[PDB]
């Protein structure tokens, strides 16, 4: 397909949202924060684009 | 509120400037007589005596005050970690009594001596 610039920004963001919770955030929180629940796989999941 | 859930909430959720009142400790008889106050906001630099718990009877200077956890560190009141390091055993201020005051700040001293104000 052919993406627009806005679509491109949105896809970019979804990729950024796929990061892990940083190691240092787990230390800062005494492990109260571990999993990223919005974790998305390209195959198994589906975006809104 | 008379309701216990509300009372605890308002204590845990109190904004920073309302937490000073959670770090207060009773004054020694002498200091009570001197400033006409039953207790004070504990400052780092005050000297304090431990009235309750494993450390009761010990005296020492106050090294740290944490408003968020409503807790103080007192010199030499410590626990030994597994590696041998010495770390503070944090204390609730209501287990503690202030023997000496750090008066180095004009504002605090003024409030202490005021009849109509409380430090």
């Amino acid at each position: 397909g052919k993406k627009s610039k806005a679509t491109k920004k949105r896809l970019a963001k979804l990729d950024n949202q796929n990061s892990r919770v940083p190691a240092w955030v787990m230390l800062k929180t005494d492990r109260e924060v571990q999993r990223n629940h919005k974790r998305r796989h390209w195959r198994r999941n589906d975006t809104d684009e | 509120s008379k309701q216990p859930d509300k009372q605890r909430k308002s204590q845990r959720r109190a904004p920073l400037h309302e937490r000073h009142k959670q770090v207060r400790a009773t004054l020694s008889a002498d200091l009570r007589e001197e400033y006409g106050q039953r207790n004070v906001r504990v400052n780092a630099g005050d000297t304090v005596e431990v009235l309750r718990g494993d450390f009761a009877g010990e005296e020492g200077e106050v090294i740290n005050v944490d408003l968020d956890k409503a807790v103080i560190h007192v010199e030499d009141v410590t626990l030994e970690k597994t590696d041998g390091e010495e770390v503070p055993r944090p204390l609730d201020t209501s287990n503690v009594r202030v023997t000496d005051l750090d008066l180095e700040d004009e504002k605090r001293e003024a409030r202490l001596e005021s009849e109509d104000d409380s430090a």
Binding site: - | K2, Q3, P4, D5
Partner: protein, 49 residues
């Protein structure tokens, strides 16, 4: 002053009821979660004009 009333009651031989009522029961059950933790005996009714 409350203490004045104490002295008077002591003089009237009646103060022991206040002593009876000075103790609180921490109640069995979940009322404490609603603010109903405590109760105490009833002692003296004072009727004025």
């Amino acid at each position: 002053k409350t203490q004045e009333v104490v002295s008077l009651l002591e003089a009237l031989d009646v103060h022991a009821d206040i002593d009876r009522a000075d103790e609180t029961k921490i109640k069995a059950g979940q009322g404490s979660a609603r603010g109903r933790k405590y109760r105490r005996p009833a002692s003296i009714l004072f009727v004025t004009s």
